[PDB]
Amino acid sequence: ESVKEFLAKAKEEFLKKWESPSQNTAQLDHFDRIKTLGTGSFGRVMLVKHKETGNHYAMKILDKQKVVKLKQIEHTLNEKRILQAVNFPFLVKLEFSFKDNSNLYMVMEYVPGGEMFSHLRRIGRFSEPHARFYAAQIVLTFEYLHSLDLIYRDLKPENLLIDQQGYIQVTDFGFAKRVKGRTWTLCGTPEYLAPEIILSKGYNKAVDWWALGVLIYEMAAGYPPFFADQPIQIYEKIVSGKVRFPSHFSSDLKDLLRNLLQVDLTKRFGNLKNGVNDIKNHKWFATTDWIAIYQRKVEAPFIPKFKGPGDTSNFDDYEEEEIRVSINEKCGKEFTEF
Numbered sequence: 001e002s003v004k005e006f007l008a009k010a011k012e013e014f015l016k017k018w019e020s021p022s023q024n025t026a027q028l029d030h031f032d033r034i035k036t037l038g039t040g041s042f043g044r045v046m047l048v049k050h051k052e053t054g055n056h057y058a059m060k061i062l063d064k065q066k067v068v069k070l071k072q073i074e075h076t077l078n079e080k081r082i083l084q085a086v087n088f089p090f091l092v093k094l095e096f097s098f099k100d101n102s103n104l105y106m107v108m109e110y111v112p113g114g115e116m117f118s119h120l121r122r123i124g125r126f127s128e129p130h131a132r133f134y135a136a137q138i139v140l141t142f143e144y145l146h147s148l149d150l151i152y153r154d155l156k157p158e159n160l161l162i163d164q165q166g167y168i169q170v171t172d173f174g175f176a177k178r179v180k181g182r183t184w185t186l187c188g189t190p191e192y193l194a195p196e197i198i199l200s201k202g203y204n205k206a207v208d209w210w211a212l213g214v215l216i217y218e219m220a221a222g223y224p225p226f227f228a229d230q231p232i233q234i235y236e237k238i239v240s241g242k243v244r245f246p247s248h249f250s251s252d253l254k255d256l257l258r259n260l261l262q263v264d265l266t267k268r269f270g271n272l273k274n275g276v277n278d279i280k281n282h283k284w285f286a287t288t289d290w291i292a293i294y295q296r297k298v299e300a301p302f303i304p305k306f307k308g309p310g311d312t313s314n315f316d317d318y319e320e321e322e323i324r325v326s327i328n329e330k331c332g333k334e335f336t337e338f
């Protein structure tokens, strides 16, 4: 009953914000630009400092014209509407959002420890306890999100940031969506796509549990289970129903992964009658105190090395380009609700 009542309150609070989203809660000239943290085909993320409070934030800047061209309108509206409505210890906090003639802006808490991906590649692989600590946070986060009828659809190490306490902050809700039943959009990252996405089926939250299998495998092995030079070769491996495990994997880990990386979605853990509890009760998680993880009382495998809330040493270097704002409004109709 404790979990039932927790999730009932979580849904109530989410729905109130979902039905009345916040809008236009800061403006660009409230901030100083520090450094570019990441860059993509329709936006980038910049470390900024608020000029009045001195607080640092990660400001995601999306170019409206490029969002339209790349057919991401609904997705960017989803991202902001969801991010402003959720509240969970392992979900990045959206502090402000606004738009101008050219861009959409999402101003999040800056997570200074860097991507999980960087740390994974620097150490090679994570031990099973280390992988399990991160995996447990994802399990709880998906329990939360799925209970709100949300599917995440972008799980991968580059989207999981390590915070000052060594815990995960999930970022990038660009593919997150409120879905009762099935959805159909082809989106994600090749190595992490569930078979039913590749096969153009109507799919559900089971794709997130498949992606958790991929993530756990990649954390524990150092490389993902299905890889190849060309996406088509990756997809052939994904749909095949075959996966090979390193001999160093424990039997418990292999068993959990066979059930998450189950090609038949009707047999996949997280999508059966027992829901998330088939995962939470699996022997690989027998040492996990789920409540202690949620309360952030477990000592982390490592604390990232950084000097202060403005330190960018755990992130990499990108060309510093202008934030130009057109003198004419672009795509005003499409982004009215943002």
Ligand SMILES: Nc1nccc2c(S(=O)(=O)N3CCCNCC3)cccc12
Residues within 6 Å of the ligand: 037, 038, 039, 045, 058, 060, 092, 108, 109, 110, 111, 112, 115, 158, 159, 161, 171, 172, 315
């Ligand atoms: N709150 C954040 N704090 C640091 C960085 C953040 C980023 S980010 O793009 O800079 N980042 C690293 C490069 C691209 N991969 C995705 C994660 C994205 C979203 C939120 C962030």
